[PDB]
């Protein structure tokens, strides 16, 4: 009877049981099929690998990412991901559990209907629900009005929400997020003199990104500080034990969120798309959006990012406007947490679509 919560992203699946405070399973949203015929010693021929095993065996596979910019685009591979999630990761029988799934802002209705069909017809779940990721993040922060900045591995959105209603006319999408930042870090470390290009080197670069990068409050001053002293350098010990030093790359990498031109994209930065989204909303709700900017997603985890957003939005907003950025410590999982809270409410239990309803509709 425990509900499951599955939050499927472009880069990572976050899955677990409703009422838990964190997802039990977090793993790459990847399906890989062997490019050649053979076996691992003591194993039979495998048709495909999903998740961590696909990443660690990727050299003899072709990898597919069934979720692109947050939207499901390969249904056969998405089914494999869900099967792996239920049977391998959570080790549950799906016909025994109501299941909450999440979807991206602006997910087409036909996509939601296909998700629902698969859950009921392929997995035989007894009930299900689909929630919008940004609305769940807002709910997790204890608010029903605010504007969510959600930035993951593949996509960044701004989603204004008014009394629990995500306003789709005002949603902004930016096709720049964590995977782009990792690639850009690889590039600029390489320019410095390092050599980071292989699959494994990308794994290390992702780790350097997550451990040493931060958002400068004043980027040009920070560049000058990095040039005048060694105070912003940080050391990082590689798997083999050799230590390297990284300087202005630490803050140049996530600067790209505010200056997408760093990777040759002509788009407004996240502060500008936040402002633009608020400005698409009725003026009478804007005070509440500016005072409730909630950040969500792995790519909002950079130290400094909330302060820099507060500064940049203050520069754009009317001069007397109260501006507040809310960046929860658990915000890499706040979509999943909002889902876990919602699915575990006695109050919620009549919002489940049951298989009987699906049979009658």
């Amino acid at each position: 009877t425990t509900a499951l919560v599955c939050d499927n992203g472009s880069g990572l699946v976050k899955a677990g049981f409703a009422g838990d405070d964190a997802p039990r399973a977090v793993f790459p949203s990847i399906v890989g099929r062997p490019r050649h015929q053979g076996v691992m010693v003591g194993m039979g021929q495998k048709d495909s690998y999903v998740g961590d095993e696909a990443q660690s065996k990727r050299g003899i596979l072709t990898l597919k990412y069934p979720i692109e910019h947050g939207i499901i685009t390969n249904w056969d591979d998405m089914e494999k991901i869900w099967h792996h999630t239920f049977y391998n990761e959570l080790r549950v029988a799906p016909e025994e559990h109501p299941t909450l799934l999440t979807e991206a802002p602006l997910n087409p209705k036909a996509n939601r209907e296909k998700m629902t069909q698969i859950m009921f017809e392929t997995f035989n779940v007894p009930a299900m629900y689909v929630a919008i990721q940004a609305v769940l993040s807002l709910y997790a922060s204890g608010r029903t009005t605010g504007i969510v900045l959600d930035s993951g591995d593949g996509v960044t959105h701004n989603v204004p929400i008014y009394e629990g209603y995500a306003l789709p006319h005002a949603i902004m999408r930016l096709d720049l997020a964590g995977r782009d930042l990792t690639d850009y870090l690889m590039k600029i470390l390489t320019e410095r003199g390092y050599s980071f290009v292989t699959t494994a080197e990308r794994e290390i670069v992702r780790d350097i990104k997550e451990k040493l990068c931060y958002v400068a409050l004043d980027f040009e001053n920070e560049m000058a500080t990095a040039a005048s002293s060694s105070s912003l350098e940080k050391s990082y010990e590689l798997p083999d034990g050799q230590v390297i030093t990284i300087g202005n790359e630490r803050f140049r990498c996530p600067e790209t969120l505010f200056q997408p031109s760093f990777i040759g994209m002509e788009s407004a930065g996240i502060h500008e798309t936040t402002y633009n989204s608020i400005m698409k909303c009725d003026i009478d709700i804007r005070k509440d959006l500016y005072a409730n900017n909630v950040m969500s997603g792995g790519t909002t985890m950079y130290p400094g990012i909330a302060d820099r957003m507060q500064k940049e939005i203050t520069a754009l907003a009317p001069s007397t406007m109260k501006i507040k950025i809310i960046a929860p410590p658990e915000r890499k999982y706040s979509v999943w947490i909002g889902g876990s809270i919602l699915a575990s409410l006695s109050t919620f239990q009549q919002m489940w679509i049951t298989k009987q309803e699906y049979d009658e509709a």
Binding site: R35, H36, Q37, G38, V39, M40, V41, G42, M43, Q55, S56, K57, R58, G59, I60, L61, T198, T199, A200
Partner: protein, 255 residues
Amino acid sequence: LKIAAFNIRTFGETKMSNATLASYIVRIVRRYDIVLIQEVRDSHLVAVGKLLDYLNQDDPNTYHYVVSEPLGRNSYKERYLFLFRPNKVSVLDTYQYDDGNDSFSREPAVVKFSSHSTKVKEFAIVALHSAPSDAVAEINSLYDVYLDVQQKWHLNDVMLMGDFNADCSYVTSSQWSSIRLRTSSTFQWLIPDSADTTATSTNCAYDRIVVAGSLLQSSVVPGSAAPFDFQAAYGLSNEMALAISDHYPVEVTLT
């Protein structure tokens, strides 16, 4: 049927990304119907996949594979990789010896083949790249691996092969009496103690091919087992030779 075992020094992405060195490895592999590659240091199977891409570029089924996970007692890990031509032989079954890291630093991969072109119809190959400082004990342990294959597959026809480090300072003349794989009359040692299996200036029979079982021993073409000196074969400089590997493949033909 040509079978080989080849320790390719630090076989991995850097070496397979070198077009010249990759070509030489492909040329060597192509000689064989079954080849065991050792010292595969390939954290994500990328180099293995690149080798297979080259081997299977024209006909997608030129070679099939059997590959281990990374093996070792500590952080330094290596895989065993068998490549085989599916039109010549078929893999019937595989397993990793476990009775494992107690007896071997790299637990032997064991593959059962069926083989319709040769006197022997089914035979197993046991792979070992021994830890040099433990070579006596590890080679002696292969005797127990042999018994295991016998018990598991009711099969006496077994080839044991690889870089056993079986010579020079790792196994001395007086130490052979301590190795049941040598003292038992069950086994024929096809690469003699006199052979040089190193591409470097040492003169050592490190790499070995051992055969057990009547039919298998009778399938061996007498005289065919030997190291393949690819420096000589391909008219290479010693420097190019060593950039490929510090060992030669050891090979054998079945009739």
